[PDB]
Structure 1
Amino acid sequence: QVCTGTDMKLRLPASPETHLDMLRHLYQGCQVVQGNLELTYLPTNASLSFLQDIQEVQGYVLIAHNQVRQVPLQRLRIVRGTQLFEDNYALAVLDNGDPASPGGLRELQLRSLTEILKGGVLIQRNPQLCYQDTILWKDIFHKNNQLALTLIDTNRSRACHPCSPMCKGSRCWGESSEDCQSLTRTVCAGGCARCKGPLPTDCCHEQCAAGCTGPKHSDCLACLHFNHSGICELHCPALVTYNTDTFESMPNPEGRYTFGASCVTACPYNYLSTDVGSCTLVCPLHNQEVTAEDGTQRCEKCPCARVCYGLGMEHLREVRAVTSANIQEFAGCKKIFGSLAFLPESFDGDPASNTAPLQPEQLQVFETLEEITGYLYISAWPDSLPDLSVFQNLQVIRGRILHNGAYSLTLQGLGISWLGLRSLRELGSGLALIHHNTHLCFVHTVPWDQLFRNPHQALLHTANRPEDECVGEGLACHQLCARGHCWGPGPTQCVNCSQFLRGQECVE
């Protein structure tokens, strides 16, 4: 039902051939996307039926470089704009069309889109796309949307039928009567932000987003603010309430944490239950996470300890890689509050600053690491290291921060023959992708279901050592391994032991 979004922008996928699986696993059956929704570089005949469910995007929606003729986000209603494309646009459709039939997105058919809270719209360089000029974008933009700006590229290369004859004002996202625009703001009596029609009787409860089916807080089709068990309120009920006479704090049985635009009993697995009554991925300043017995984590106020940070956080916020210059900052860590990334640059070095290449002996810094808050991205690696022994003691990747916003773990272009991640027990989020590691095997030897914690997790893989070639060398899990399942060759690599261990080897 709820899944996170992505942060790829216009970056090409590392493995385009796995792109549809990436998207299917991340979004199939997801109605609400935390963060941004991005579809970039899809093929003409791509199958995106799994995205028919999305109703809401917290951030921006980007459709770009897609030759996909149809992108059926027909249930999308609300784009919140909490983060914007180019820091300004809630919606962007870019580069759709070729330079017997041509590819390129033809129409958007967003029959459901009625609200943009923040951010503008960009529909540019899309020679095969029509009806981007047939929307009353100012109605969609919310009353409090200061960037109610739409830029349309009308230099089209395709002849199109005018909007369905059934569209009011000829306002549509397409040629069908089902592709016509609904109006929720600029048609509202009394100047109310949202309504379901032209009468004062049609004004929606203030707490409603994108319209309503009636004036009650239970009639909102979506909340502007928060959904408390179907009830829209301007805030979630205080997690801790106050005494009638003294106003002293006391637990609120009706108290909830704010999650997205919903109120929850407790924050979802791998989210932080902040003491203030909110759900985060990252604790507020001067609050540390505390792990709960139920798999949730909570943020409580500290006088804080020194904390290990990874990429995308703090002073490493603008740093996209682990290098020989910053590898030492992970010394002594059990957990990293951020991501790790090993790029060819990490291992090639960078003469611009006379920085030495990262050496394999420096990767030992992660041997004490049990948990990664963000993602682990390895697109380079010493070939002197046949496995990932470096992370053999890694137990958990929370993946709150994903690579390109999609992967909690990606490995590509390595000389490793097996992974060997003996201690890995959990993947909190995102997908994993392994590719173009033609020496690598022990891919199908670890049911990945044992590490996954939610319905949107999957392993994507390609261009690894062919399974047939690997087993042809006699490479298989030791018969002593529980279920014959392992991370690599040898009894030392068993996912579990049927008998007992000798050190890490399963023995009898």
Structure 2
Amino acid sequence: NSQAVCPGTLYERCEVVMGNLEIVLTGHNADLSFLQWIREVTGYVLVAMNEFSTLPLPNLRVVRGTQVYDGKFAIFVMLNYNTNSSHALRQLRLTQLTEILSGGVYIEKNDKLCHMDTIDWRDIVRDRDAEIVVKDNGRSCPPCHEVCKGRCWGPGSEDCQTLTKTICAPQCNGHCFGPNPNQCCHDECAGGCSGPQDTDCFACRHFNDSGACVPRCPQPLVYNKLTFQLEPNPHTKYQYGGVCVASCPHNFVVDQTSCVRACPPDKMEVDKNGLKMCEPCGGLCPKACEGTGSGSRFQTVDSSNIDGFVNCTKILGNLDFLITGLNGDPWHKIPALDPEKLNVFRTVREITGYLNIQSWPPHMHNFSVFSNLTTIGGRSLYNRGFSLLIMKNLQVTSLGFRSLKEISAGRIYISANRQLCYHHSLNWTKVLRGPTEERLDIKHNRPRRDCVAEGKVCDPLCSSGGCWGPGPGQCLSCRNYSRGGVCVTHCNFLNGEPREFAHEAECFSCHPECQPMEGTATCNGSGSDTCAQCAHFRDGPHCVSSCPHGVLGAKGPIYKYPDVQNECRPCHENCTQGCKGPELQDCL
């Protein structure tokens, strides 16, 4: 459907050129008809070093000049002739050129170019301080046809310039389609017009929706008067420059309400039912890095390679933490790894292969820098089929793999970690997948008894499943409820702050707009249409903080007021910027 727009740096049925139309160094027999439908060039037009005889831009009506050439020109036409032959630019068939919103005109030194000294350029240029430089071109050019009244883009009777502009009633501020005070141009007009409508503009001040000059494109979300909330808008159009389009140019993508070539750094390209859009990344954006060991040729994380993990959320391959990496290799001198630089791994959620820890800084008592690691794949293993191996780490008290829930394959080796507690009671089968028998080499860590006697056992709120360390937030799963991934004793159902509802075994807060009820449930769920009672105002089913005031519905903006009972009801049918009540006296 009429994707009428094209980039500048100008093909088949293009109507608007988003960007500049640059034409340089093209030969005399170039096919230029593909430029036929261009109606608007949002940049500037540059025509230099060519040898074709006629520039066919019959439909070109506006040159917007959002960008200008040489700092001052919306049109720049220079040097279009070969010396040792007579192939040259003879005609600018700009027969419909109606206006130029920004910048001036430079047409100089085109030896066979005629009639450019005839045009009233000040009539086309909207900028009163713009530069017009037309000179040293034609020589002996044939005269304008008798009809054209001394102004033409060519010799023919239909190659005339038409004066467009008229003196404007001081009422209109330059924008008028006649001299009378009646004939002001629509506000959404960049220049002049042929009549008072948003559909009669020569050019749009902000956006263009199927020919209509509008202040915004039809939005993604529209208030629904029967639903009392915003709703998806099936008539949404997105911004490509100043043109509302139904679909983005075909390898553009949508960053809410706009067409862009690639997502911003805080968002990521999701496909929604075949609609390429940009969704916000929950924190940081999915970056995968290749790991360490076999299939890489780092064989350990070290002070030379570590930064190559900054902001990395998925590891393609393995992560090996050997002694030479940690403490340095003075012989092939790799300096000693800075311990704090291990926090770069806090951002890791998946490891595709194995994790392998044979050395750790002695002051760090746990592998808590992997508190966000959820998944060890084990699709490549280490030694005797191990996906997780933790060996001879003498200062480590606890594992601290808070958020680990899946070791997809491989075996688990945790041995010689002589001060290691909290792992004795842990039920690996809830984490470890596949057949359970054969799979555990867990020996010669701290003796269980020692752990028990120092009170280094799981928090009581943990389930029979175990913990990765002391306290509620190290549990594998909670006995009852959890709030913010911390095991807890209850939810704030009938008292307490913030009041909450429970979904599955988690405590979530009620909507901020629900009124805290005393000794009865405040809500069944997260949405403001689930509260027992609104604090503040009710809008249909929804508890809101203040009634709608100018939210865009389908037929204009919606405006409401608070009732006696505080329920939002609509403003008088004959108001504008709102109301304080239903009466006609109450508006604005």
What TM-score, normalized to structure 1? 0.49
Q: Which of 1 and 2 has greater Rg? A: 2
If asked which structure has higher relative contact order (CA below 8 Å, sep 6+), I would say: 1
What TM-score, normalized to structure 2? 0.43
Structure with the largest fraction of helix: 1
